Design a protein around this ligand. Structure first.
Ligand SMILES: CC(=O)O[C@H]1C(=O)[C@@]2(C)[C@H]([C@H](OC(=O)c3ccccc3)[C@]3(O)C[C@H](OC(=O)[C@H](O)[C@@H](NC(=O)c4ccccc4)c4ccccc4)C(C)=C1C3(C)C)[C@]1(OC(C)=O)CO[C@@H]1C[C@@H]2O
Ligand SMILES: Nc1nc2c(ncn2[C@@H]2O[C@H](COP(=O)(O)OP(=O)(O)OP(=O)(O)O)[C@@H](O)[C@H]2O)c(=O)[nH]1
Ligand SMILES: Nc1nc2c(ncn2[C@@H]2O[C@H](COP(=O)(O)OP(=O)(O)O)[C@@H](O)[C@H]2O)c(=O)[nH]1
Ligand SMILES: [Mg+2]
Lengths: 427, 440
């Protein structure tokens, strides 16, 4: 379990997926052309995790970019990063599905399937033993929602003992840009909690709040939003490609964070948040990074963590850190904020100390927890889905392809059963 | 006797195990490259030094008998890139391609049995080269899947093949206060269910207690795992100090299981390292006989998060090293017994096994410990150890009453009723630990 295959689905997944490889190549010192720049003993020995050793000393990633918009792939290969990806994994279509879940699931998304699963079997034979699959999709579109959920059911069918760590994008309940978003988000959870072993809740509303408060960025664009997401995706698989004191595997983050198969929605986070210019005014210490992880203004979710109760928390301290300062500052938060942690599990947060440091920052830390406050985001989507289903609005766009009124009732019923289980363990 | 086989498994086994051989090479003057430079003869690196732990091969080289078996390649591959890469044989390192994480079910039934057929062949070929094998040495880590699952599986297969072998163990019990894992109490009850019915002596150490022995005593501002492994390595070196050298009272490993473990069960001794002094206060200490002896029973110098004053002492074992007087040992222990705090049992009239060692120990350069003239090792068995086992049981009853993490064990190959039998065996051990200790 040392090779990780990353797959990007949809236009939103391609913008975040392609930007994710730019940060990975910078840590290991890989040029955007193919020839490696600087190799060390802690980086060259772990190049097989996200890259493959081809010919003439060329390292190419195993990214699988599948979408239904030709303008998305053509906008990446013509830049200055498409030379690293193999020109054999980009699989697109002619027609676009738009924001319809029924098109990319069995209508327009059913045209590929065999072509997408063909490149997956080729990468499994070239590697020794697979580990996980990082699928980056979104909830609200047509390709990332319709075809993104169908690909998860096909990988688990052929690889039942493989991890399915997906980075889904949850809708924002504060002024959305689409209309048929609850219809594409409700049907996505019905196919996500039945195959994916773990997922992460990320919304776009909490991204603009961070750039306008801590980062102090005047009118952030779509490029700056990918930096906060790629930093969390790269901060999870740190002990797999770098040694450390208390390492952690992808299966370790599932046993210690998923108490019940129906409860696997996590809350991502990162630290610190130093603005441009205030570098000397901020001290990078262990107690400073701890307060930034348990704060409500630094979370990538639209839910309030103070209202709910925490269950399983996972911390990842990187850089020149000491285990003594980690275990001390961790107990002070649990002892002071005892009302936020449930007494049913005395071990709500574990320790994962790393030894390497990112290129630039001296001390980095991320926050991953599975509190009971995640049910608030599921209630806002359920209220908007039930209000539009009563009037039968925007229904002919799905029933004309092959949908039925029985499938929408089963997807809505599963949304109420998930929220009902979070209230039982919360008490 | 002669040779002693050392086995290091798990995450803590591969880290602390490297610090044990680092101290052994400094006391015997063994070059890390695998030579005999700086030593020649003398008991500090001669015929009495090459025997035990290490092994004499050809071309003037000396390789140890350590067998590093870890289910994570991110730890074994790091040791190969370090300076201590020429000591042990390259074939002794057996890595894996599937991380068992911290799950006891995978490292005992699925992943634990994939390498079980290969680890038994290395021990069999190594035991044949030992002209008179004494016992074994294990380094467990209760809190994961490799140091708990593979460790309990290897101990069961090794006890059935041999039997009459001093199978030592230096496990690391979880801290009763700050924990490091979520499914940590699950890997603790399942480990003690098979450790009691196979192992003969399991030295327990607490990671939280070492933090107190370095911040208040050593005054270390930022202690890490590089300093915790040095204190535990000095404890293992103090037990086998009478066998690897000379002294007035030679103590064998078979004597630790007689004067401390009279019953077939109950074999969980504690540890309290006394020579704990920093380099800044090295000129403000007398290091007398009665001063170091009184520091053994102090809770501040104990490597186990427990209060021995609330309980009663059953059987102690002191290991005096360096240059000490035989008459001063019998007088310093008598003063402690007359304090009316030890609370000796009625059957044992003494219970203070002493062990005078003539070879003075040393300290690792990566620590704040100076070269002392004497060292005292405390290996006692108190009745307050059941208090630490009670706190672990309380954390297991809360997670089992509502079925917290259960599907991770049943889906791999473990019956749900196994947790009930393991809890009943742990509860029966704690019940008999207080009933016998109340009138011993
Ligand atoms: C003069 C100087 O030291 O400038 C720093 C800097 O001022 C600060 C504020 C940087 C700066 O980062 C940001 O402002 C930022 C912007 C969007 C999203 C996230 C951060 C920096 O832009 C980011 C840049 O980061 C890197 O160079 C890392 O290698 C980083 N790289 C990227 O994210 C990256 C950006 C563009 C293109 C390619 C890569 C990285 C981190 C983790 C893993 C891989 C790479 C650094 C240290 C700085 C500047 C340049 C000002 C900080 O961020 C990082 C990631 O280091 C923000 O807080 C830290 C602290 C740094 O000191
Ligand atoms: N004091 C100390 N403890 C360690 C060290 N390395 C590992 N540990 C132990 O490892 C535990 C952390 O859990 P894990 O990362 O899963 O390690 P593990 O319990 O040995 O399980 P595996 O990693 O599968 O071997 C801690 O509770 C420690 O007791 C170390 O270097 N020093
Ligand atoms: N955070 C973030 N969200 C994005 C980005 N690009 C698109 N999105 C989200 O994706 C949604 C649109 O999805 P869309 O591209 O139409 O899906 P598709 O038709 O299947 O490709 C919008 O609601 C955005 O919120 C990005 O760069 N960052
Ligand atoms: Mg390990």
């Amino acid at each position: 379990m040392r090779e990780i295959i990353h797959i990007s689905t949809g236009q939103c997944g391609n913008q975040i997926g392609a930007k994710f490889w730019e940060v990975i190549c910078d840590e290991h010192g890989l040029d955007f052309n193919g020839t490696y720049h600087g190799h060390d003993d802690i980086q060259k020995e772990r190049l097989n995790v996200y890259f493959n050793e081809a010919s003439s000393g060329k390292w190419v990633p195993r990214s699988i970019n599948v979408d239904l918009e030709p303008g998305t792939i053509d906008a990446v290969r013509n830049s200055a990063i498409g030379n690293l990806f193999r020109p054999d994994n980009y699989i697109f279509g002619q027609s676009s599905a738009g924001n319809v879940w029924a098109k990319g699931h069995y209508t327009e998304g059913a045209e590929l399937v065999d072509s997408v699963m063909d490149v997956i079997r080729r990468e499994a034979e070239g590697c020794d033993s697979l580990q996980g699959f990082q699928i980056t999709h979104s909830l609200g579109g047509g390709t990332g929602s319709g075809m993104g959920t169908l690909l998860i059911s096909k990988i688990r069918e052929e690889f039942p003992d493989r991890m399915m760590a997906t980075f889904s994008v949850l809708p924002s309940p504060k002024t959305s840009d689409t209309v048929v978003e609850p219809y594409n988000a409700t049907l996505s959870v019905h196919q996500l909690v039945e195959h994916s072993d773990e997922t992460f809740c990320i919304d776009n509303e909490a991204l603009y709040d961070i750039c306008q408060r801590t980062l102090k960025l005047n009118q952030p664009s779509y490029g700056d939003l990918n930096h906060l997401v790629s930093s969390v995706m790269s901060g999870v698989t740190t002990s797999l490609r770098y040694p450390g004191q208390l390492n952690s595997d992808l299966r370790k983050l599932a046993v210690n964070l998923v108490p019940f198969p129906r409860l696997h929605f996590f809350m991502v986070g990162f630290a610190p948040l130093t603005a441009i210019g205030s570098q000397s005014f901020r001290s990078l210490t262990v107690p400073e990074l701890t307060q930034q992880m348990f704060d409500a203004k630094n979370m990538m979710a639209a839910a309030d963590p103070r209202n709910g109760r925490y269950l399983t928390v996972a911390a990842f301290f990187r850089g020149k850190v000491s285990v003594k300062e980690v275990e001390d500052e961790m107990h002070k938060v649990q002892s002071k904020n005892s009302d936020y942690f449930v007494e049913w599990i005395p071990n709500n947060v574990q320790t994962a100390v790393c030894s390497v440091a990112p290129q630039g920052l001296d001390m980095a830390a991320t926050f991953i927890a599975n509190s009971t406050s995640i049910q608030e985001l599921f209630k806002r989507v359920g209220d908007q889905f039930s209000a539009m289903f009563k009037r039968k609005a925007f229904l002919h766009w799905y029933t004309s392809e092959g949908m039925d009124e029985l499938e929408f009732s089963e997807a809505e019923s599963n949304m109420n059963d998930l929220v009902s289980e979070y209230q039982q363990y919360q008490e | 006797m002669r040779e002693v086989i050392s086995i290091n498994v798990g995450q803590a086994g591969c880290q602390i195990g490297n610090a044990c051989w680092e101290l052994y090479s400094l006391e015997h003057g063994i070059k890390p490259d695998g030579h005999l430079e700086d030593g020649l003869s003398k008991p500090k690196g001669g015929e009495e030094g090459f025997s035990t732990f290490f092994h004499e091969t050809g071309y003037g080289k000396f390789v140890p008998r350590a067998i590093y078996v870890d289910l994570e390649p991110n730890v074994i591959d790091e040791v190969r890139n370090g300076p201590y890469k020429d000591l042990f044989h390259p074939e002794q390192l057996i890595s894996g391609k599937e991380d068992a994480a911290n799950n006891y079910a995978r490292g005992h039934y699925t992943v634990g049995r994939e390498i079980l057929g290969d680890v038994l062949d290395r021990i069999r070929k190594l035991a044949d080269q030992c002209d008179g094998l004494q016992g074994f040495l294990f380094t467990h880590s209760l809190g994961g899947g490799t140091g708990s699952g593979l460790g309990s599986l290897l101990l069961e297969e090794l006890s059935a093949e041999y039997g009459k072998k001093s199978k030592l163990e230096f496990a690391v019990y979880p801290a009763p206060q700050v924990s490091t894992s979520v499914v940590e109490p699950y890997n603790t009850v399942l480990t003690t269910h098979t450790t009691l019915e196979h192992a003969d002596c399991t030295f327990m150490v607490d990671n939280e207690a070492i933090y107190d022995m370095c911040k208040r005593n050593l005054d270390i501002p930022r202690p890490s795992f590089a300093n915790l492994n040095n204190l535990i390595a000095q404890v293992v070196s103090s037990v086998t100090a009478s066998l690897r050298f000379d002294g007035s009272l030679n103590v064998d490993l078979n004597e630790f299981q007689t004067n401390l473990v009279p019953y077939p069960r109950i074999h969980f001794p504690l540890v309290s390292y006394s020579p704990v002094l920093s380099k800044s206060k090295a000129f403000h200490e007398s290091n007398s006989v009665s001063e170091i002896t009184n520091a053994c029973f102090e809770p501040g110098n104990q490597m186990v998060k427990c209060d021995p004053r609330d309980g009663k002492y059953m059987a102690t074992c002191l290991l005096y090293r360096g240059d000490v007087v035989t008459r001063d040992v019998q007088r310093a222990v008598e003063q402690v017994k007359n304090k009316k705090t030890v609370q000796l049992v009625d059957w044992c009239p003494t219970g203070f096994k002493i062990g005078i060692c003539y070879e003075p120990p040393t300290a690792t350069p990566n620590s704040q410990l100076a070269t002392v003239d004497r060292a005292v090792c405390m290996l006692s068995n108190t009745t307050s150890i059941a208090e630490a086992w009670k706190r672990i049981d309380r954390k297991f009853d809360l997670m089992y009453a509502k079925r917290a993490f259960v599907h991770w064990y049943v889906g791999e190959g473990m019956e749900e009723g196994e947790f009930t039998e393991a809890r009943e065996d742990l509860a029966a051990l704690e019940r008999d630990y207080i009933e016998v200790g109340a009138d011993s």
